[PDB]
Amino acid sequence: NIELALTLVSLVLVVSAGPLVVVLLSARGGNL
Amino acid sequence: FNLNGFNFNQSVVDSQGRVLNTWADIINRANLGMEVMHERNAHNFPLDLA
Amino acid sequence: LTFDEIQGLTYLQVKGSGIANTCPVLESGTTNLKELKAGSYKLENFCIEPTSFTVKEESQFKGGETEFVKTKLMTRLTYTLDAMSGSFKVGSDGSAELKEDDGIDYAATTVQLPGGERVAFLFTIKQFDGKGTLDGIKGDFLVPSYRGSSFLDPKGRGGSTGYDNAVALPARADAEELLKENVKITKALKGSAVFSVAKVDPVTGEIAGVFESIQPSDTDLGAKPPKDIKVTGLWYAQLK
Amino acid sequence: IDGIREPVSGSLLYGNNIITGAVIPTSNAIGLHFYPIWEAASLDEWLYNGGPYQLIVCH
Amino acid sequence: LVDERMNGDGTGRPFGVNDPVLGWVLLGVFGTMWAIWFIGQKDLGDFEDADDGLKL
Amino acid sequence: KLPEAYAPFAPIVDVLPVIPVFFILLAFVWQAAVSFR
Amino acid sequence: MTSILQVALLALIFVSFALVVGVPVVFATPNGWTDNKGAVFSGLSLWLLLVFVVGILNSFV
Amino acid sequence: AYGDSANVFGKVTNKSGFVPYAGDGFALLLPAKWNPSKENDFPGVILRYEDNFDAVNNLVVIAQDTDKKAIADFGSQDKFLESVSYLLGKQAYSGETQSEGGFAPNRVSAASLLDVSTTTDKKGKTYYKYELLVRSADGDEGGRHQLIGATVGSDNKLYIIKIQIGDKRWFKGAKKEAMGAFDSFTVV
Amino acid sequence: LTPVDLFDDRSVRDRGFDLIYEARDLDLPQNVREGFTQARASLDETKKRVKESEARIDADLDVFIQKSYWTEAREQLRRQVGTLRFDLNTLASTKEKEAKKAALGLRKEFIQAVEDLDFALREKDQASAAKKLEITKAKLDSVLAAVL
Amino acid sequence: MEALVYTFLLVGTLGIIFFSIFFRDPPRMI
Amino acid sequence: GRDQETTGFAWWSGNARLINLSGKLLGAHVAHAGLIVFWAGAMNLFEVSHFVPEKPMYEQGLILLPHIATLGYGVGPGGEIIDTFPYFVSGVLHLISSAVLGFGGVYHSLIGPETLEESYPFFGYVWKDKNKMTNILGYHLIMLGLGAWLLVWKAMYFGGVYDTWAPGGGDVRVITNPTTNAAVIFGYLVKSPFGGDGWICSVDNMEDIIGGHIWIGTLEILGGIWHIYTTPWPWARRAFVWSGEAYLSYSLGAIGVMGFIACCMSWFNNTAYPSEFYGPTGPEASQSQAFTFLVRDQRLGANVASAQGPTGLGKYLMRSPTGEIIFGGETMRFWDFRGPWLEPLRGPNGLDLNKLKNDIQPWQERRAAEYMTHAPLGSLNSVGGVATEINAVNFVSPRSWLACSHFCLGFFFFIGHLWHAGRARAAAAGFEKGIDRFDEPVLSMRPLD
Amino acid sequence: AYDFVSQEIRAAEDPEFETFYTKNILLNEGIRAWMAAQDQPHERLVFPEEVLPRGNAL
Ligand SMILES: CCCCCCCCCCCCCCCCCC(=O)OC[C@H](CO[C@@H]1O[C@H](CO[C@H]2O[C@H](CO)[C@H](O)[C@H](O)[C@H]2O)[C@H](O)[C@H](O)[C@H]1O)OC(=O)CCCCCCCCCCCCCCCCC
Ligand code: CLA
Ligand code: CLA
Ligand code: CLA
Ligand code: CLA
Ligand SMILES: CCCCCCCCCCCCCCCC(=O)OC[C@H](CO[C@@H]1O[C@H](CS(=O)(=O)O)[C@@H](O)[C@H](O)[C@H]1O)OC(=O)CCCCCCCCCCCCCCC
Ligand SMILES: CC1=C(/C=C/C(C)=C/C=C/C(C)=C/C=C/C=C(C)/C=C/C=C(C)/C=C/C2=C(C)CCCC2(C)C)C(C)(C)CCC1
Ligand SMILES: CC1=C(/C=C/C(C)=C/C=C/C(C)=C/C=C/C=C(C)/C=C/C=C(C)/C=C/C2=C(C)CCCC2(C)C)C(C)(C)CCC1
Ligand SMILES: CC1=C(/C=C/C(C)=C/C=C/C(C)=C/C=C/C=C(C)/C=C/C=C(C)/C=C/C2=C(C)CCCC2(C)C)C(C)(C)CCC1
Ligand code: OEX
Ligand SMILES: [Cl-]
Ligand SMILES: [Cl-]
């Protein structure tokens, strides 16, 4: 079921995209 | 506003589509005993919408 | 207010005013009572508004006479009989025949005695058939049982549905109290009413007058003796 | 209470005790309508239709 | 009809007035007590300059 | 459904309403990253 | 035309994913907004260009 | 304790909402959420399922032995239902009343026939199918829908199905369970 | 103990009985449930009610205006007329595309005549409502000479 | 009769409430 | 960022650190206003994607699409949905604008100045400056005033809005004559909130709604100009607390009432919340049942006027406590219900049973039977009956979600009023950190209080 | 503490005496008869639907 699988891929790319900001900003720089 | 409590009545169903009772179905038997007897002369119509 | 004055109001203007509980007064038209053309008429917008509820109460005292006493009303504005269909016949000399078939021809009404006793009744004229001259259209209607057969008392018993006994007293479940548990009597009684046509407006076919009825009150499904209630007031119809 | 013209007793002087006595809610025929003393004809009509409840609950 | 009503149960009158004396009750009692507050306003402080409230 | 020039993008749309629940959770991750100072 | 709209909208998702991650990273790095100013301006002016492309291409469907 | 694997990620076996039944001489598709009742309302009951939720929703088959070979031998469909009028119950209240509304005097219940038919199957035997709405003075369930169907089998035996559904449940989806059971009734 | 009694009501479903049962099963589409599919599928049933709607307008609505029965003229224009907007789209969606704009253009101004008659009947202006009605019947005949 | 007993128990409970407020043992400081 | 010992606020009250930080507080609001527009974009497109045309709008769990349908975008006569693309444009224009609001909200929260007082003196503000606070209050009333004229222009000029009371059935109606009479417009406001009045939840036609938004549009443009050119008068200096948490608490008590109003608005009103889109009201579905069994039993040969109930009041038609012929049953409580399917059957003296024995229209019994099976009772897992009902349908009315969410949000924001108005009045007084322990004011009072 | 006997004697000798107590006694009769065919399966009691207590139209 590709319509259900893309909804899961769209979930993981976005649910990471918040902590991806927090992880990357912690490593390089650090003004959070 | 009639949002109501969880209604898990006839939720557990085996194969061949038959209803397995739960404790929620026993609460429903106690629930629908009260509602066929509360305000016992008010209701002219089958749905207690009020 | 007349009929055309009521119908010239919207629903929100007449709502909550008590105007909706009233019969249309017949302001135009004369009391000559003969120029009404003889023949048959079907009787629509036939409505009856009472003015007094008096009830033949036995005296509080020992040697007191039993008369009709003034009462105050417990139900609010739910007592007018309104929009009844039927047939109206008048003779060549003045003999008139009033008859209603369908419509709102009953009104449950609680009225309270001076003394604190609440007597309830349904004010009805249902299935009326009355004959006589235009000062009296003497006839009888039926008063049904005030509660239906499927009415249930506080102990859960009744006529059509119910236990038929006192279930909370399991040793004296059926006993000397069979008057109020074993049969719930829903037999309909009869009442008599006297109509008197007072004004005729023949150009619009509208007639009005004064009525006088006496009917039984309520038997509590056959548990108390029903009392007699004399209802007077006005009435109105449209001969078309 | 139920608007069906059967009255429900809740008073100590009408055969009730502390457990079963209650000030009965307003009539179902009234509904959410505002029913003070001055909107009744008599004071007994106010007492019949559950008038005291709406005066307690509003205050 | 049978009894006497005030007949204002669902009529939607402004502040629930239907006799005009009820509106003068509203303005009389408000106006009497506005005037007592106004005459007594000389004991409450003259908060006349701009930074003169309970502020933070 | 969506207009049919956009219905292949309907898998992304089913994820879009829950995103402001993740915005309140991101405030807790950011405060955990500074150790709740 | 439909297929160039879906490519332009997929491109809008990747550019928006570049901004949802990148723009808070460029902002809260120390002296990162002065160094990476012209990248974000090229990112925003591409993102804003891609919105008005897809809206005009929706008129042709 | 025989080891069969659990149905992880597996296809369902019954989404039809009907269970096929085979009694003695008949076959029908019962409503799948209904369960057997241990009640014999009538003389001749073989099976009687009722709903799990309320016991008003139920069906019953009745096999009376008869001397006649065809259902037309019982007379017409109008003269048939007055013979088998015991299916609708009996008014156990022989009290006098004129205050119930929408009924004749002294009647606290009034059945109303709404539909008849004369449908058949692949064997050739015609059926007498009925559809009633039986209202009561208290008016429980908003009335009760009756689905009566009757035929005589190949062994001179009168098979009568009667599906009773309360009207409150009728518009809320028990028409699909009842009509699907009522059309599935075939006497072999 | 007495049996229950039957009544010959096998023709009430032929007239009007099984109509609220079609509007309560949630397996049908709502265009089937609201009566919208049945109006679009049978053209003559709309052509029956539209000729019936002008019988309620051309003859039955002026009578309440000279006797000034406002709440019986506000709702004369909504009771059986209360399908006329949906009906005049179905009768106009059977035409040519340059005939449909002629149909829906005339249908649009008859809407503006009824909604102006309603407002005339709302402030109880008898001199305006008796005038707005004659405009309304003229715009009514222009639509019905176009879609049928 | 019992309603007389009921009101005496309700008046008596409201009496103790009146004495517990306006005749309470006053909390002495220090 | 910022920490505790430089502020005195922990991590769990750290938005209180940016009270006196004007620029950071601006980015806090613009990023939050991004979220309201983002939710309104995302939940719109979620409801467009999950819209099924062969089902009602209220059956599908749609709460945002009935708002755009009430404006009349993409609806036909009788509430039929013509096209869904007007609902799609509303979803994208919010979802794209949320990135713009999200950008400047993230900008002023991270890169923009902390306090915009010394560099940008037009936008700078101190909370105790009573002129600048009314100046910002006046700017936003003009925005609310011009926003209220958008509804008037869309109803009068830009296609019209959906009138469910329209002659010929409900469709989109240009409101050519909005009611500008002050006795009618300000008559709702002084009306009682109880039964038969419903304060402002009984506004029964769209001409009062659009004509009332003319009044709320002009008064907010005039009241905005009033606060730009004035400062609060000395009696208002005397009554208010002039801190930023006070101004929040003033807004929290105002908006917590508005949550209670829109709770009872969506539950009772069916003009601004049309039943074709939101489903029947509580009163509407209960009155629809009594109307359904009145038409069911006239056809089965019964005089519904003369039909006496088991209590003796009347099974189908009884009399209202003010004398109107109404429906009988437990739905006597909802006798003051008005509906566009029911009002064609209603004369002056309540319902007209001559009109109701002969002139029941087939579309009225279509619609009232729909409303009976879509009563606003359900369950929390969206079952859809009384609590004694099996898992058959999948339904909770939008009115049941809109009222229940906005009573809870209206209740908590009244609690947020009581929190912040107590705190800001106490923090301006100085004792919000505690008793001073040197001059405890109870110790300077006379005992036996 | 099931019954107040002085209010059961009165409510059986007076068919119009209703309190919230006698309403509670009727609701308990509803709970008892409608659950015990399924709450107590060891009793193996079958109740025909016409013997369970029932108000009007529910
Ligand atoms: C069906 C109908 C129902 C009824 C209608 C219902 C709706 C009514 C809503 C109307 C709007 C109400 C809003 C009122 C705001 C009041 C705010 C306030 O606190 O207002 C505060 C201000 C304070 O004003 C300032 O007050 C100051 C106080 O000074 C005093 O103190 C000073 C130092 O502080 C100096 O010492 C000075 O000398 C001394 O006089 C100064 O005097 C200033 O000059 C003065 O401008 O008041 C003012 O501006 C004026 C206030 C407004 C006018 C109030 C009129 C009240 C009614 C009058 C009619 C009564 C009828 C009686 C009938 C009798 C028969 C029965
Ligand atoms: C609507 C919610 C909301 C908003 C707008 C803010 C906003 C803010 N908070 Mg608050 N906060 C919130 C909820 C919120 N907070 C909650 C729920 C808590 C409790 C957990 C806190 C607890 C808290 C504390 C304890 C503090 C703040 C502070 C701040 C400010 C500085 C932010 C900072 O330096 O972070 C830096 C962090 C990052 C850069 C991490 C990355 C996060 C980015 C912004 C996410 C953006 C994602 C988005 C998709 C980007 C889109 C871009 C666009 C182009 C499309 C800022 C204005 C601080 C303050 O007062 O400053 C003086 C402070 O000390 N907050
Ligand atoms: C406040 C306005 C509001 C309203 C009236 C609705 C109403 C509705 N929504 Mg929408 N929704 C909202 C806000 C709202 N939602 C928000 C903020 C979001 C973003 C998350 C969504 C996202 C959303 C989606 C994605 C979907 C809906 C759906 C629905 C429908 C069914 C919802 C349901 O089953 O809830 C079930 C009931 C609950 C979840 C109870 C909520 C109680 C909350 C969680 C508080 C619990 C208290 C707890 C202790 C506090 C937690 C914090 C603590 C641990 C510290 C209904 C029409 C569905 C639908 O019909 O789509 C067509 C659907 O698929 N909504
Ligand atoms: C967002 C809206 C908003 C806000 C927050 C303010 C805030 C303020 N205004 Mg402004 N104003 C606004 C909109 C707003 N205004 C608009 C739209 C107008 C044009 C109509 C005005 C016209 C205006 C004037 C002319 C004045 C203010 C004043 C004030 C100040 C004190 C107000 C006060 O204490 O009232 C307290 C209110 C009362 C004491 C009235 C009694 C209220 C009770 C509940 C009865 C209300 C009856 C009423 C008819 C409403 C009935 C319905 C109701 C129950 C819902 C304060 C700074 C005063 C000031 O200092 O400005 C310089 C002032 O003189 N305002
Ligand atoms: C628009 C409204 C608004 C605004 C701007 C503020 C702003 C502020 N509040 Mg106030 N507050 C509000 C509404 C508001 N509040 C309401 C409605 C309540 C009642 C619930 C409170 C109760 C409250 C308390 C008790 C406190 C504040 C505090 C504060 C300050 C910092 C808050 C912070 O960093 O949060 C940080 C955020 C968190 C720690 C996360 C909390 C999340 C909770 C668990 C809810 C989760 C959401 C969930 C889905 C909702 C479920 C309920 C639903 C069923 C309706 C700041 C000045 C604090 C302060 O310093 O006082 C000045 C403080 O102690 N507020
Ligand atoms: C009518 C209400 C409803 C009826 C309720 C019926 C039940 C009541 C139950 C409660 C009874 C009282 C409990 C104990 C009170 C106590 O100890 O107070 C202690 C205080 C002592 O305070 C000190 O008393 C001092 C005086 S002295 O010391 O007592 O002489 C004084 O100087 C000093 O200032 C003061 O601090 O007593 C007094 O102040 C006054 C003396 C109180 C006398 C007892 C009253 C008994 C009730 C009679 C009421 C009428 C009943 C018949 C009609 C219904
Ligand atoms: C529109 C769109 C978009 C955008 C999106 C967005 C905007 C997103 C965001 C997102 C986000 C923003 C996310 C976030 C997330 C977060 C999270 C997911 C978190 C979680 C957490 C957890 C889970 C934990 C927590 C904790 C801590 C840490 C502390 C406290 C305690 C606890 C444990 C609770 C894109 C571009 C894609 C494109 C498409 C469309
Ligand atoms: C400060 C801060 C914060 C906050 C933040 C925020 C709140 C933000 C916001 C943000 C936002 C508010 C964002 C937004 C964004 C958006 C976007 C980015 C969008 C985009 C869009 C798109 C992408 C679209 C698309 C489409 C179309 C066009 C159509 C079809 C469909 C689709 C979907 C595909 C926190 C709390 C974390 C913490 C502290 C810090
Ligand atoms: C749109 C619309 C409309 C209109 C509306 C309007 C026009 C409104 C206005 C309104 C208003 C006009 C409102 C007002 C309000 C006010 C208030 C609510 C007040 C409050 C007050 C306060 C809050 C105060 C407090 C206090 C005191 C007590 C004294 C002084 C100081 C203090 C602060 C302490 C109508 C309905 C027709 C229809 C629908 C739509
Ligand atoms: O109000 Mn006391 O409980 Ca609410 O459901 Mn209908 O209404 Mn009456 O019944 Mn069930
Ligand atoms: Cl009860
Ligand atoms: Cl009912």
DSSP K307-319: ---SSSS-SSEEE
Closest atom of ligand 4 to CA, residue K231: 62
The alpha-carbon gap from K73 to the nearest alpha carbon of chain I, in Å, equals: 17
Nearest to C53 by CA among C140, C112, C106: C112
Question: Rg for chain A (alpha carbons), in Å?
Answer: 14
Give me the residues paired with residue H145 across strands.
Answer: H133, H165
Q: Where are the beta strands (DSSP E) in chain I?
A: 2-3
H94 at B interface, C-beta within 8 A: no
Structural domain span for residue I84: 1-148
Q: Which residues of D touch L18 (CB under 8 A)?
A: 6-9
Q: Which residue of J has its CA nearest to D16?
A: J3
Of F2, H103, C30, nearest in space to K303 by CA: H103
As a residue count, chain A comes to 32
Contact (CB, 8 A) for C227 and C56: yes
- Is B43 within any annotated ligand binding site? no
Q: Does G36 touch chain K (CB under 8 A)?
A: no
- One-letter amino acid of C186: T
The DSSP element (H or E) to which D32 belongs, if any, is none
H16, H52, H141 ranked by CB distance to B10: nearest: H52
| Long-range contacts at K177-185 (CB < 8 A, ≥ 24 apart) | K177/I119, K177/K207, K178/K152, K178/K207, K178/K210, K178/K211, K178/K214, K179/K207, K179/K208, K179/K210, K179/K211, K179/K212, K180/K211, K180/K214, K180/K215, K181/K211, K182/K215, K184/K208, K184/K211, K185/K211, K185/K212, K185/K215
Q: What is the largest CA-CA distance in chain K?
A: 88
Q: How far apart are CA H84 and CA H76, in angstroms?
A: 13
Helical (H) or strand (E) element with C103: strand C95-104
Helix (H, G, I), strand (E, B) or coil at C112: strand
Query: In a 3-state reduction of DSSP, which class is residue E5?
Result: coil
Pair of tokens at residue K156: 């009068």
Helices (H), G1-61: 3-27, 32-35, 37-59
- Distance separating alpha carbons of residues F32 and K1, to the nearest angstrom: 13
Q: How many domains does chain I have?
A: 1
Tell me the pairing of strands H58-65 and H186-187.
unpaired
Note whether L51 contacts H: Cβ–Cβ < 8 A.
Answer: no
Distance from CA of H138 to the nearest CA of C (A): 5
Expressed in angstroms and rounded, the spacing between residue F19 Cα and the centre of ligand 5 is 20
If you take atom 48 of ligand 6, which residue's CA is the nearest one? J15
Is K294:H86 a contact under the CB 8 Å cutoff? no
CATH of domain G1-61: 1.10.287.740
Task: Please identify, by atom number, the ligand 2 atom nearest to the C-alpha of residue K25.
Answer: 57
Residue to mutate, J23, J24, J25, ligand 6, most ligand atoms under 8 Å from C-beta: J23
Phi-psi region at I68: left, alpha or beta (left = phi > 0; alpha = psi -120 to 50):
left
Distance J17 CA to ligand 6 centre (A): 12
Backbone φ and ψ for K242, nearest 5 degrees, come out as -115, 45
Cβ-proximal residues to H43 (8 Å cutoff; 6+ apart), any chain = H62, H64
Contacts of C2 (CB under 8 A, 6+ apart): C24, C25, C26, C27, C28
Contacts of D19 in chain J (CB under 8 A): none
Residue type, I128: S
Nearest CA to ligand 7 atom 21: F25
**Integer angstrom CA distances of residue G9 from C197, K89, K193:** 84, 15, 51
Interchain CB contact of J27 with K (< 8 Å): yes
Instruction: Answer whether CATH 1.10.10.670 is correct for domain K280-375.
Output: yes
Q: Return the beta strands (E) in K132-276 as ranges.
A: 161-163, 171-173, 241-242
Q: How many whole angstroms separate alpha carbon I40 and alpha carbon B48?
A: 36
Q: Which two tokens stand for residue K381?
A: 């897992």
* Atom number, ligand 9, closest to the C-alpha of residue K239: 31
A15 C-beta closer than 6 A to ligand 7: yes
* B interface test, pick of L32, L34, L45, L49 with most B CB neighbours within 10 Å: L34
Q: What is the DSSP string of K131-148?
A: HHHHHHHHHHHHHHHHHH
Tokens of H122: 């692949």
Q: Which residue does chain K place closest to J27, by CA atoms?
A: K448
The CA distance from K293 to A24, in Å, is 67
Method: cryo-EM
Query: Domain limits of chain G?
Result: 1-61
User: For residue H120, what are the β-bridge partners?
Assistant: H126
Q: Crossing angle, helix I126-144 and helix I43-57, to 10 degrees?
A: 150
**Residue for token digits 């007064």?**
C25
Please name the residues in contact with K36: beta carbons below 8 A apart, sequence gap of 6 or more: none
Q: Which of L52, B6, I126, C57 is nearest to K396 (CA)?
A: B6
B3 inside 8 A of chain K by CB:
yes
Domains and CATH numbers, chain H: 1-188 (3.40.1000.10)
Give chain K positions within 8 Å (CB) of E53: 128, 130, 237-238, 240-242
Nearest CB among K1, K4, K49 relative to F1 is that of K49
What resolution does the deposited structure have, in angstroms?
2.7
* Residues composing chain B: 50
Would an 8 Å CB–CB cutoff place K85 in contact with chain F?
yes
Separation between Cα atoms, residue K16 and residue K21, nearest integer Å: 10
Answer whether K215 contacts ligand 4 (Cβ < 6 A). no
CA–CA dist K192, K199 (Å, integer): 5
Residue tagged 């109701």 (tokens) = K356
Helix (H, G, I), strand (E, B) or coil at K396: coil
**K320 burial level (CB within 10 Å; 0-12, 13-18, 19+):** buried
Strand partners, H115: H131
Torsion of CA K429, K435, K438, K441, to 10 degrees: 70
Report residue C194 as tokens.
Answer: 């006297």
Q: Is the CB of residue C203 less than 8 Å from the CB of residue C26?
A: no
Using a CB-CB distance cutoff of 8 angstroms, which residues of chain K are in contact with residue B49?
A: 282, 285-286, 289, 331, 375, 377
Strands E54-55 and K241-242: parallel
Mutational test site, ligand 1, from K235, K237, K240, max ligand atoms within 8 Å of CB: K235
> Is B25 labelled a binding residue?
no
| Angle formed at CA L35 by CA L31 and CA L37, multiple of 5 degrees | 140
Ligand 1 environment, Cβ below 6 A: E 14-15, 17, 23-24, 26-28, 30-31, 34, 41-42, 46; K 235
Yes or no: say if G33 and K116 are a contact pair by the CB < 8 Å rule.
no
K327 to chain E nearest CA, in Å?
Answer: 17
Report the nearest atom of ligand 9 relative to the CA of K148: 1
Residue of chain J minimizing CA distance to K445: J29
At position B47, the amino acid (one-letter code) is L
Against chain I, the chains showing at least 3 CB pairs within 8 Å are C, H, K
Task: For residues K62 and C5, give the distance between their C-alpha atoms in angstroms, rounded to a whole number.
Answer: 46
- CA–CA separation, C103 vs C125, rounded Å? 10
Q: Is H68 helix (H, G, I), strand (E, B) or coil?
A: coil
Q: Could you tell me if the CB of K181 is within 6 A of ligand 4?
A: no
- Chains touching E (3+ CB pairs < 8 Å): C, D, K
Burial class (CB in 10 A: 0-12, 13-18, 19+), K164: buried
Residue type, position I104, single letter: L
Please tell me which of the candidates E2, E5, E7 has its beta carbon nearest to residue C51.
Answer: E2
CB contacts, 8 Å: H37 with chain L: 46
Contacts of D53 in chain L (CB under 8 A): none
Q: How far apart are CA K117 and CA K124, in angstroms?
A: 4
Residue with tokens 């009522």: H182
Output the residue whose Cα is nearest ligand 9's atom 9.
Answer: K216
L9 to chain C: closest CA residue: C169
Contact status, residue H187 vs residue H126, Cβ threshold 8 Å: no
Shortest Cα distance, chain H CAs vs residue C150, angstroms: 5
In this complex, is the C-beta atom of C16 within 8 Å of any C-beta atom belonging to chain E?
yes
Q: Per residue, what are the HEC states of K230-247?
A: CCCCHHHHHHCEECHHHH
User: CB count, 10 Å around CB of I9?
Assistant: 19
What number of other Cβ atoms are within 10 A of residue D38's Cβ? 10
